[PDB]
């Protein structure tokens, strides 16, 4: 029984129920993430920005089943084209808008990675991606509005790949957390 999360803490409690087992009902997780109405006061603690690039702020460790984190995108900040290390990835906008560009997995032959499609993710919307679907880049293209998104990855992962748009070549990147549970972790 999926009920509307009343607050971010309620959403977290519901996610611990949805990930109590060993599999993941993607449509139910996405529906509950979409149903949480972003309340800035509830997540201000985690919305720690950096002037030069987007930040990853860990919110909950999901009893080991998933990492829930808040990403803070300054104006013009964006990600590399990347995969998700065989994990489910949910991305819910909490403030602002983000452009998501989708790319297919490259072939071994060096080639320009051409976008398959693009879309604008708006406040409160929840997107989903996994490696079977493809790769993506996420960008705050706004010149005037910072964006904040809530991401859930299951299983959690600390490393993934960035892809060079010009060649399709990939490199392993280790991600780091800017803060954990509201505490800056330099
Ligand atoms: Fe991603």
Swiss-Prot record:
GO molecular function: cysteine dioxygenase activity; ferrous iron binding; nickel cation binding; zinc ion binding
Its EC number(s): 1.13.11.20
Gene: Cdo1
UniProt-recorded name of the protein: Cysteine dioxygenase type 1
Keyword entries, A-Z: Dioxygenase, Iron, Metal-binding, Oxidoreductase, Thioether bond
UniProt-listed Gene3D superfamilies: Jelly Rolls
Family the entry assigns: Belongs to the cysteine dioxygenase family.
Post-translational modification, as annotated: The thioether cross-link between Cys-89 and Tyr-153 plays a structural role through stabilizing the Fe(2+) ion, and prevents the production of highly damaging free hydroxyl radicals by holding the oxygen radical via hydroxyl hydrogen.
Gene Ontology CC annotations of this record: cytosol
Assembly, per entry: Monomer.
Function in brief: Catalyzes the oxidation of cysteine to cysteine sulfinic acid with addition of molecular dioxygen.
